[PDB]
Symmetry: D2
Subunit: 359 residues, 4 copies
């Protein structure tokens, strides 16, 4: 017959002519050569989350390269200056950068990428939950092993093997942590009692960083570079266990949240611009983004996480939700990559931080 006219008209509508960029991947070379830099450059034009990874690289580079001319009479406010450690290259920046990491990222090999950022003061403030605090120190005492996601936990428990995803922390590691930290907690309580020291999570994490005295440790580098590290639920993990058992041997330690919320929420107020790089969700994400409401919004933003907004969670909220709160500025152009961080962070570092440090 003749096809229905409504179908013809609906399937074959006219379209606007577009001048936007085109979708195009990197073409691997016909001789087997593989150009990683062209691969990385084309991610922005590959679509779906590869495109968001490219936009996130762009966003971090805007943080690293932001500059301005101070108002008459003002001096320039700079960040990333470092703690003057011999031989360590630092690069001053006009944008202050906050890093949030979930604890499992320190369990993973991302620890080595994060350490690189903190060693060179390429971020200025870190928020990390308690697991990521303690496991950085524990890794200076004993390693975490490769395992598998599907191995019966009954068998692991009978062997004293604690599972974190497809990783294994033998429980002996925590006995070694106990041996290391108990004399430090004794000294901290002695200083509280005799010198009036008022402990908070950030002050304790600074002290533990100096104590571990080991260049393999992220929080050692944070302490050496005077990078504050906040962790308002610092007792939610093995450090909490150590505080628990310590307190029956030596009672009276106080760990205060109030001083640390003053200090955290004041962190974004001096800088001309702030950038936030949030790897994972939960407390570290809300703590950083809420602090940035105090300056009427973060100016540059990257989220990388596996959450989605359909459950109403803070973890899953899009950057757009944070705009409604004032936690992201009205002028920002934020980026979320929907991905597991171990697949993403290495290429983010290659495309932004490392290139910047090489200038």
């Amino acid at each position: 017959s003749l096809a229905p006219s409504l179908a013809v008209d609906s399937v074959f509508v006219e379209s606007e002519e577009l001048t936007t960029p085109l979708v195009k991947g990197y073409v691997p070379d016909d001789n087997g050569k593989f150009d990683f830099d062209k691969m990385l450059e084309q991610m922005k034009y590959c679509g779906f989350q590869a495109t968001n990874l490219g936009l996130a690289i762009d966003q971090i580079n805007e943080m690293l390269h932001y500059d301005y001319e101070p108002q008459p009479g003002d001096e320039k406010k700079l960040f990333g200056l470092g703690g003057g450690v011999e031989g360590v290259k630092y690069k001053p920046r006009a944008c202050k950068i906050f890093l949030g990491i979930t604890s499992n990222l320190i369990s993973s090999g991302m620890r080595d990428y994060i350490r690189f950022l903190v060693k060179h003061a390429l971020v200025d403030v870190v928020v990390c939950t308690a697991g990521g605090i303690e496991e950085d120190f524990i890794k200076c005492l004993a390693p975490t092993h490769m395992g598998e996601f599907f191995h019966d936990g009954h068998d692991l428990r009978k062997r004293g093997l604690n599972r974190i995803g497809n990783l294994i922390v033998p429980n002996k590691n925590y006995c070694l942590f106990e041996d290391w930290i108990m004399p430090i907690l004794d000294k901290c309580l002695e200083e509280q009692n005799t010198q009036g020291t008022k402990w908070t999570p950030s002050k304790l994490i600074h002290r533990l960083g100096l104590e571990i005295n080991n260049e393999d440790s992220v929080w050692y580098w944070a302490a050496k570079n005077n990078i504050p590290v906040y962790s308002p639920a610092l007792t939610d993990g093995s450090i909490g266990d150590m505080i628990y058992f310590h307190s029956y041997n030596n009672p009276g330690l106080v760990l205060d949240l109030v001083e640390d919320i003053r200090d955290m929420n004041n962190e974004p107020l001096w800088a001309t611009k702030t950038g936030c790089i949030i790897l994972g969700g939960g407390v570290v994400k809300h703590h950083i983004m809420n602090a940035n409401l105090y300056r009427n919004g973060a100016d540059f933003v990257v989220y990388v996480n596996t959450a989605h907004d359909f459950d109403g969670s803070d973890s899953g909220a899009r950057p757009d939700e944070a705009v409604s709160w004032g936690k992201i500025s009205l002028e920002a152009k934020p980026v979320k990559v929907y991905a597991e961080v171990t697949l993403v962070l290495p290429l983010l570092v290659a495309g932004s931080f490392s290139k910047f440090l090489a200038e």
Copy 2:
């Protein structure tokens, strides 16, 4: 031709005869009648997450009905006794029950289901992040409104409308919270200074529950029933904001984590059995499950959350991972429902808690 013999042999293997239950849904009645009780009863045999919901109902009923005969010379250790509020039905239990909730569940209408559990002391300890603490009190001052997931946050911010998923909290609600809480913080600091009171998150949440003095509030009922509520990152939210601004008007408040980790981790040690019901992930999940390591494992367990274990997160970890740590006992038969809680909790309550209370 003749089909390949390897294909014949591989496609048509013999099978073992099984005596396990059969998959079978509820058959709605041909006249339009719908029997919700038969619907609920058949979930266990429907497959996929409906089956897990049925198993979770079974698991909670095992918590509610667990009983034992004390050893010679011992008395029976009971829970769920309540605070003797007039007219309120309570039901003593030999299993102690921990409830963990993410903050957004209090933003949602799940607040009414959770309030029911706390009012009747059908749970004994709650862990809830700061958002769920404050928004329960705020809802006694002003309501949260229905919105949508896709409404530009630039427009919302210009209108002072804070978005939580598809919900809206007008910022005026937080000004009302400020008016309500500032005199309380003044009094708490006065008691710290003159009576030596040592504030912790759980002690403060108890006090705020009594202060709101309103039967619509979950944490009012927790305080009246002497149900401890822990929240180790209590500053990660609007209460943190209020503490911040209060502290410039009236400095010196201390909010201690150490006493609260002693108290939290001792909560599981008296009971003959413990059950854990964890709605959502993050801090509330780790805090409860880790506490239960101190008794060598929780005995009954239900998780309901939208996370998955592939990212190595604590939120996404299966119950099997907690077994490896000793946080779930070797003899437990735990259940996870992979689902958004607002779709699940009402039917869990119908199938377990409500039926129990009606006995």
Copy 3:
């Protein structure tokens, strides 16, 4: 000191006064009674996906109750008339309804809810992938059993036990299917050869429905009610296996896609309005939504699935994407519930289809 003025101004902005509905859950009764109808009624005001479930119930009720006055000279075009089966209640409708289901929903106990809809001609066209076609017939020969998600597949294979999620299909079930279907395929090929019959997936599924001749079967009811069932990849499953082995014993069967794409894409063109209810994603979702482009868009739409749009997949695309294509009309108000269907479909049926049938 004095708190920073920028922080004061940013945290305490003024807000617009709102007249939108309020978030409010159902309050279970203090004596243990549980009112499922009030539970269901309040889902719309509970937030997150409970709200979307309430909106989806509303959307389906709009399909079931849509009515109009024909233009002068026209008669009213009605659907849901049924096939005149004795004793079966039917309810004519002016909105034509398409149902899409993934194969695993027939493996599950949702088979009983879907059968209810098809028996009463509460939907007019179904699209279902091959697994859901064959397993409906197989369940008339032998049942599917309950199993578990975590049981080593090496052990299951050695026992001839095929796993579908937490369900088990003993391989003997497929040998029984072979015995049942081979004489039918013989007859179909005989009719092709002697009567010129031109087989398509929808024509074959109709024939298999009549052959099974069993009121337990969804596709039996579809055939009796002259509900077309499309499945353009009908060979992607056990029916494909049976066609394969049959063809070496008796070659020449032809199964044509061309006639079936004419017939599928013409299905939406007569009705005054169309509604689409898509349970799961993949082929069934694209096939139905694309067909509705031929009328310039579906008028009412519900999606229920576990996919997300971040991967660019057709499965994960929001209704908004289908609007851009013309597959959903510009005036529609579509609804997606982000959830596993076994947790959702029973309450959708209770709130819409069953209530409608009871009128």
Copy 4:
């Protein structure tokens, strides 16, 4: 006091000493240099999905390098020989390789990586849904543009702009496709009528590949290298639309599934070993894995997809489920990467296919 002895004993259990590999990331160089090869090499030891990506690279390299000594009297059965195109490097292999791709991967820039594999006959059989068939040809006529996930579909439709995730296909592209394909369908129907040609999806896709006659096209290279391409729902997309409208101008085309299920399910039976690389889920995943049941299982397997098994879907099923069916051999060591393919495929190619081609 003294800490409870049960807590001491439970928190500080003894652990087995392990000899398994250690978690360790790549350490970016302190001068800003970034070694992509060491990055890639360390993924296996980074944890979570980076580890699975490393294992997937290993699995593909096992496919590419598998070799064997034929039994006495047999000759070696080889694959990847190519179609003798001048200048194109091919590498014979004893393992036959199946590639499955969802349609959106051809919409994306992954088209360029996939084309590389097909051009060099580094895979032997492809299964791709209809969207990925047509959009490869359409891209030879007009490009796909970059867009965004959040742009109102009402506005896009009024402009004739079809959205695929964050990509845009102007509808004019489909009018150009119509102009290109209608004379081909005319000729195919002429050959059916005058020469008895029996069209199937794979035979049509071969013909369209030769017709486009363009080295930018994946399916051109498949046809030139005699790589069969299966697509049992080939009408589920724009090719289906074109067949629809063509059939009213020129009726009688038949597109048969039966011959194509014989041919697909026979593809795995000759090779000494088979490997399956499945990018995305749905039909392409089931079609390939089910075919491999016919040889009693695939020997090497990589899945990369964003699905999870909790919904019982075929898309979300772990490799372990396919073992239960016999679709994966009992001796295989399969790998799934839980990730969006655009973030994963480039590094899979760099680590396996490209290195292999360079030998």
